[PDB]
Write an enzyme that holds these catalytic residues in place. Structure first.
Site, PDB file in Angstrom:
ATOM      1  N   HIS C 252      22.139  35.350   2.184  1.00  0.00           N
ATOM      2  CA  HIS C 252      20.826  35.546   2.757  1.00  0.00           C
ATOM      3  C   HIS C 252      20.289  36.811   3.045  1.00  0.00           C
ATOM      4  O   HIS C 252      19.128  37.065   2.626  1.00  0.00           O
ATOM      5  CB  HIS C 252      20.969  34.820   4.323  1.00  0.00           C
ATOM      6  CG  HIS C 252      20.613  33.236   4.280  1.00  0.00           C
ATOM      7  ND1 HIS C 252      21.892  32.491   3.972  1.00  0.00           N
ATOM      8  CD2 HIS C 252      19.596  32.346   4.237  1.00  0.00           C
ATOM      9  CE1 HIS C 252      21.585  31.286   3.992  1.00  0.00           C
ATOM     10  NE2 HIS C 252      20.108  30.970   3.938  1.00  0.00           N
ATOM     11  N   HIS C 348      23.480  29.237  11.430  1.00  0.00           N
ATOM     12  CA  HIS C 348      22.545  29.644   9.935  1.00  0.00           C
ATOM     13  C   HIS C 348      21.826  30.880  10.349  1.00  0.00           C
ATOM     14  O   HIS C 348      20.618  30.658  10.125  1.00  0.00           O
ATOM     15  CB  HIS C 348      21.856  28.405   9.771  1.00  0.00           C
ATOM     16  CG  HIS C 348      21.488  28.378   8.427  1.00  0.00           C
ATOM     17  ND1 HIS C 348      21.891  27.398   7.369  1.00  0.00           N
ATOM     18  CD2 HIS C 348      20.540  29.252   7.835  1.00  0.00           C
ATOM     19  CE1 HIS C 348      21.302  27.634   6.459  1.00  0.00           C
ATOM     20  NE2 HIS C 348      20.314  28.564   6.561  1.00  0.00           N
ATOM     21  N   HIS C 428      12.760  32.693   9.429  1.00  0.00           N
ATOM     22  CA  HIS C 428      13.196  33.653   8.582  1.00  0.00           C
ATOM     23  C   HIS C 428      12.608  34.907   8.693  1.00  0.00           C
ATOM     24  O   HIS C 428      11.701  35.144   9.228  1.00  0.00           O
ATOM     25  CB  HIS C 428      12.889  33.233   7.249  1.00  0.00           C
ATOM     26  CG  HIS C 428      13.864  32.010   6.833  1.00  0.00           C
ATOM     27  ND1 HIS C 428      13.528  30.879   7.421  1.00  0.00           N
ATOM     28  CD2 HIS C 428      14.375  31.544   5.880  1.00  0.00           C
ATOM     29  CE1 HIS C 428      14.130  29.869   6.951  1.00  0.00           C
ATOM     30  NE2 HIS C 428      14.876  30.405   5.854  1.00  0.00           N
TER      31      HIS C 428
HETATM   32  C1  LIG Z   1      18.368  22.636   3.627  1.00  0.00           C
HETATM   33  C2  LIG Z   1      18.766  23.672   2.463  1.00  0.00           C
HETATM   34  C3  LIG Z   1      18.576  23.561   1.046  1.00  0.00           C
HETATM   35  C4  LIG Z   1      18.862  24.559   0.049  1.00  0.00           C
HETATM   36  O1  LIG Z   1      18.724  24.305  -1.195  1.00  0.00           O
HETATM   37  O2  LIG Z   1      18.814  25.967   0.206  1.00  0.00           O
HETATM   38  C5  LIG Z   1      18.996  26.026   1.901  1.00  0.00           C
HETATM   39  C6  LIG Z   1      19.124  27.720   2.080  1.00  0.00           C
HETATM   40  C7  LIG Z   1      19.146  27.832   3.611  1.00  0.00           C
HETATM   41  O3  LIG Z   1      19.106  28.918   3.962  1.00  0.00           O
HETATM   42  C8  LIG Z   1      18.873  26.797   4.616  1.00  0.00           C
HETATM   43  C9  LIG Z   1      18.890  25.470   4.279  1.00  0.00           C
HETATM   44  C10 LIG Z   1      18.835  25.329   2.861  1.00  0.00           C
END
Ligand SMILES: Cc1cc(=O)oc2cc(O)ccc12
Ligand SMILES: Cc1cc(=O)oc2cc(O)ccc12
Ligand SMILES: Cc1cc(=O)oc2cc(O)ccc12
EC number: 2.8.2.22
Lengths: 564, 563, 563
Positions: C252, C348, C428
């Site tokens: 991320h 998350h 985000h």
């Molecule tokens: C639900 C989901 C599918 C995905 O392909 O990538 C993600 C990335 C994220 O940070 C959070 C959720 C998902």
């Protein structure tokens, strides 16, 4: 100028220690463009009772190494080595002092007793001083099992849940690979980094180094994880093949056949079950592959044997330490390296393979089912096992126990016989064909007569040998040993025997003696038992460097054969 | 769960593009545990005149790939593919649309004409539309040669001087490996990263990809630098072997024998000369190795032939300074340089043929001629002009004869009186046809042991010979190309091979126009009718950089690829 | 010497294409020991409406590359490039024709629409023709998720059972990394092999390439699986670090601070829970690491926030089974799964911002909200609906206020009375604009802690906030997108960033139409005028496989790339 190469030691080239970097107790005498023959190498024993190692070296070897291979050195020692040859019709001889470095164990933690595995010499009969044994054992990594294959989610799993694991990737451990002599000294070491790296996350270098078997060239094959190998005693990795993309998790065995191929024991990745769920299957597939790594044939045992047969599966010891407890199977045991019936569970646990040249067939040791011959045609030829649990068409393939005169022996479905020394095998290993033509097996003896005994120490192992009449469908037990030696000679897992024609002995290695003895080093017992008198000619103990750590196998290696 | 796998495309499994990651114009139909037989694949032609590619697929392949191999796609295209099989005794068929990505040349610079090598279709006789040709060519790297083996300092050299170089490490170039159809379309590409990496300095991924030969399994062997390989048309690297430690610099050839061994052309590292100096010898040793990478046998040509023979060496083109005749010197430093003796390029062996009949090898020495050498390490016969050869070797020379068997008179330079007969000069691919005759590509540089008045007077030949080993005679029984002149002259590389299926002589001239400064080099694919000499196929391949030779090409057959 | 290097192209050295081998739409002009200054490069547009790319090149770059970096080529094209410099006080200029090869997608299968992702230019206001955007997107691999971390077996589990999985190893996908201009042409490509290899099982080359952020040097940081990286626009990998041994699964975000450190988002491996069971925690730790790869500091969010808070978690879309509200369970096995507690995806965290002013970090928790945490490991403020929060945390919640400073009344679900004000949900990129305000991409899944009657009632917002930390108030000062409805709704991923150079809000919605089964997923690049809200740029990027989300995009500036 730069840095010069090592200068010639005597009358040939330099003497290079560990030329390939994988075998530190080896060296090479560089040929330096000398044309030589009749080459013979002698590594003198260290001190008083020290074992001497001596062998001839063939042309192919001299050409391959561009030098004379020196095998059998002691660690951290001024080894005294004699090389003899013929050059220009004249007889030649050089005496070398070959200094070596140390054996390193790269996998140690607070469990470690010491760095190396200890040897105790118990018995060496006169005329067996020269024997060398290659020990295929292993040592726990600090990390333990850190990786799984990812499987397919079942329809009855939580909607929120992550996907499950599949297969047997966690079957992973550092190797500990050495040759021991009858003074109990290490005379060869295979560097652990040759095949393994337990600190990196490269699955190409993880697994369980197993199925070390000699080839017609005096080299050895082996499996580890997702690769299979061929190496030689100079530490040269001669072949390194990835498993074909359809297969995974090669363990237990690798054997070269006379046709040039290699048999492996793998699992099928992305195997589609009748219910449509995809799994990696466990220890239930056989490959024949060529030295190109291509598939010549495959035996899918899930379609050849009965994967729902739990006669032995249900009779098994839970044990570490939940030992002395009979395995209670469950309908919902998740797929994986787990006791259970069905494709995707450990229902067969095949642990050895033998090639019957006579009828182009294979003999399999299945830990959880018994011992079977299967044809090239993928039909069961015969089965050696208790009769319980087997259905027709397969029940018809069970061999019938007979005596020295050929009269039926009477046995219940659990394999308990009347008025006879005959017994079946249970959780056995290394169902191989001897030079005599007979079937030799290491009868581990866990779940004997398809039950756990009243008390835990009421177990024993056997070196057994059968004679099989295939046209008649009869089996005769013709030799056994170890039944009288009790728990102290009981290997619940691993282990191997092999008949030795040269001195008419039965060689054996019990790899998990006292496995369940909490806090105690596991014992690997190398034995040679005289075939006629049943006397102990050799007995050597190898003690694990960490408590409760099984050994796998050992081999009787002959230096005369190493350098064709 | 997390990320799902590709779902089934039709009635089998998913269809994966470039499963092994080295062959972007291939795909695989996952078996998905289906039990199938009688498999047949068809890749349909692109557009109006597009060549369809069709083949059966064996059980070994199905099992090895765990799926159906799809070969012959076009790049950057929606390929249409049909797969037929038998399953549970029922007849089954799927039609797949298989999208591909682009072919990438990773080695471009200001010399680049464009990214890919250009193809020009010149002639395709009816009944030859289906032909496929694997082109083994290469492309200059930006840096050029950047590494040398270190040699041993010579005692006639300066006290303060650094050690010299030895061997042929600089013989190193990016590969450009593809299959072309008779519409001049690329139908296969081997990713350059499969074997090579010219940006890194890992010598294990350097050298000159060469000697790509079909095996009895429908796979191919190759050599590059210090390794030899086996791969298949799915881009799977099946074998990857280091040369045995005494040897270096494998080039030009690799051929599997019927006995499971492989013949290689290497040099000897740390070869001790009689004056005591150690060198890496150049292109003058043959290894027989098994599929374990061990040495079954070694032919040391410096003790079998004559390294002092300068008959052909003295008469060679120097080519920067092309055209000039090569003036040899006694003090040429050891290395990849024209010269006599171990440690110079006295032999330059560039092809091998195993003769199963008598367990011997036929070699092509660019600088000496063509020779059969036995298992016993004895010369059996030599095909060459007689000049410079001394006894005991002189006596193994084959003697030219006519159709009736009568001597042809030739001077020591290989010039013959009243005859079409001519020897070969700076030749290649001395192989044994399916007929049992000897086929050679006669490059023709140094023809008749001299340079011509004018460079344009050179020509190349396809040529074929009938040898009687008992009698010790040679007969020229077929030739072609002499009358095509300069635009057919390949000074280097190149190959021929007799094709029995359609009675043609296949040819590839690799260096046509090599010396036209600034112009693409031409590789000419040809199939010549053996009876009529009619051109049945002619396709030109143009280098992506000027003055950049091609090596070889092979005629490949899809129906053999997937045993 | 043997094979020569590329010769000089003009008045400097050779011009090498893709010198480092990871960026095929770049080139380098070798310096060849020339001493130059005042360097300027111009890559001319292709054809009539083609966007020209121009930039200065600094001395550090000249020295690092040993040459002039050429960025912004087109693929498979004869690019025309002009280089200007000063040398010996004289003005110098060269015009080069730089041929390129093709861009290759190495991960295709029967799901593939075609090889590359398609671009559709929708709107380009005058004065925005020069804009360049780096798209950080991805492409499914054939096999999907194939590896799991091994966890510790739970005592409530079966005696015979194999050990469970833990952590998030399956979070793994091939990268698709490129720069697009306002004609929708690819002007840069990062080779997928640079960081990733989905065919091999070397975990060091696996994971999810993410958090590509500009550094103060005009280079970029990224994370993928168990490594973090730094690279530049020439495709040079400048740093490659393993995560410290206690940590795993970096995803991320990765951002360089002004203090030379880098902030990362990871999980803790072998994290010991209070019940004694060890797990790899999911997306709930922040590392500060130095350029030696050592840990400067660690924020363990499981002890700083509240892992039991299910306010937003309970209200989430389950999406195979999209649309449905997520019914949590007490026995959800540990892993990358919606749930409470260490070892489940309770937090998350998906973005990080360093606040230099007070040495603290602002985090975006997809499942909890937006929080500032100090160097001291104390929560400074929380931006979120008040439901589920208990003291001591409840008291750090920011209180909404109007333009004059007066309270806005909101229920515990973040629904406000008589106001444009709304909190963010599943958001985000909570970053700090050059204005000092907080910018967030408000995805809007789970808006007002409930699911709507109809899925199509969801919307996403660009939104901006003014926070008074002293007063403890928050003010919504700018929003956009609510009125664009469903065709602007990104359920996941996505980013915004305020652009001061031209007073625009840059945006990239990464998952538009994600749930339209069978349709390409849309990534929408937008520049929105901050004053007028006029769309100055709109460009759509369509996935090469259906239902395949994009992650982020960045606005890149050529004149900053080569310090
Ligand atoms: C639900 C989901 C599918 C995905 O392909 O990538 C993600 C990335 C994220 O940070 C959070 C959720 C998902
Ligand atoms: C229980 C066990 C432990 C081990 O270390 O190795 C094994 C090998 C086998 O084939 C079967 C069982 C075991
Ligand atoms: C002279 C020359 C140039 C080249 O590029 O390649 C060669 C290959 C050979 O086998 C022999 C000669 C050459």
């Amino acid at each position: 100028a730069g840095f010069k190469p090592a200068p010639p030691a005597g009358q040939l080239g330099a003497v290079i220690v560990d030329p390939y970097g994988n075998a530190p107790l080896t060296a090479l005498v560089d040929l330096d463009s000398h044309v030589i023959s009749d080459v013979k190498v002698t590594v003198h024993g260290k001190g008083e009772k020290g074992v001497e190692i001596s062998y001839p070296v063939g042309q192919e070897s001299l050409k391959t190494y561009d030098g004379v291979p020196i095998f059998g050195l002691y660690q951290k020692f001024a080894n005294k080595v004699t090389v003899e040859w013929k050059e220009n019709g004249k007889v030649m001889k050089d005496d070398y002092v070959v200094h070596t470095s140390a054996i390193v164990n790269n996998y140690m933690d607070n469990r470690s007793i010491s760095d190396l595995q200890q040897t105790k010499v118990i018995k060496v009969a006169p005329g067996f001083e020269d024997r060398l044994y290659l020990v295929n054992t292993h040592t726990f990594t600090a990390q333990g099992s850190d990786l799984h294959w990812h499987g397919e989610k079942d329809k009855n799993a939580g909607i929120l849940d992550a996907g499950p694991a599949t297969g047997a990737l966690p079957f992973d451990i550092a190797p500990f690979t050495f040759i021991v002599d009858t003074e109990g000294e290490y005379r060869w070491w295979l560097d652990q980094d040759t095949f393994y790296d337990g600190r990196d996350r490269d699955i190409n270098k993880r697994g369980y180094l197993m199925g070390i078997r000699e080839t017609p060239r005096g080299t050895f094959t082996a499996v580890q994880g997702q690769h299979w190998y061929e190496f030689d005693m100079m530490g040269q990795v001669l072949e390194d093949h990835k498993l074909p993309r359809g297969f995974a998790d090669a363990t237990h065995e690798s054997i070269e056949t006379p046709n040039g191929t290699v048999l492996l024991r793998v699992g099928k990745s992305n195997y589609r079950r009748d219910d449509g769920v995809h799994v990696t299957t466990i220890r239930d597939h056989i490959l024949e592959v060529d030295k190109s790594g291509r598939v010549v044939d495959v035996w899918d045992l899930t379609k050849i044997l009965d994967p729902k047969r739990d006669a032995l599966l249900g009779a098994l010891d839970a044990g570490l330490a939940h030992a002395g407890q009979q395995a209670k199977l469950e309908p919902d045991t998740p797929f994986g390296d787990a006791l259970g019936v069905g494709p995707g569970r450990n229902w067969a646990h095949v642990n050895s393979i033998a090639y019957d040249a006579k009828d182009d067939s294979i003999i399999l040791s299945s830990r959880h089912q018994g011992v079977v011959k299967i044809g090239r045609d993928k039909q069961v030829k015969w089965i050696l096992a208790p009769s319980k649990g087997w259905e027709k068409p397969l029940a018809s393939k069970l061999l019938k126990p007979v005596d020295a005169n050929g009269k039926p022996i009477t046995c219940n479905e659990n394999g308990l016989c009347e008025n006879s020394d005959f017994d079946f095998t249970y959780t056995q290993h290394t169902a191989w064909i001897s030079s005599k033509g007979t079937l030799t097996i290491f009868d581990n003896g866990d779940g004997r007569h398809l039950e756990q005994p009243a008390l835990p120490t009421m177990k024993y192992s056997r070196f057994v040998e059968y004679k099989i009449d295939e046209k008649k469908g009869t089996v005769q037990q013709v030799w056994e040993y170890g039944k009288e030696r009790g728990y102290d000679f009981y290997s619940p897992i691993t282990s191997i025997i092999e008949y030795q024609a040269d001195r008419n002995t039965m060689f054996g290695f019990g790899g998990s003696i006292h496995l369940f003895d909490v806090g105690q080093p596991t014992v690997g017992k190398l034995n040679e038992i005289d075939y006629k008198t049943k006397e102990v000619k050799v007995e050597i103990d190898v003690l694990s460097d960490k408590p409760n750590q099984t050994h796998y196998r050992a081999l009787l290696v002959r230096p005369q054969q190493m350098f064709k």
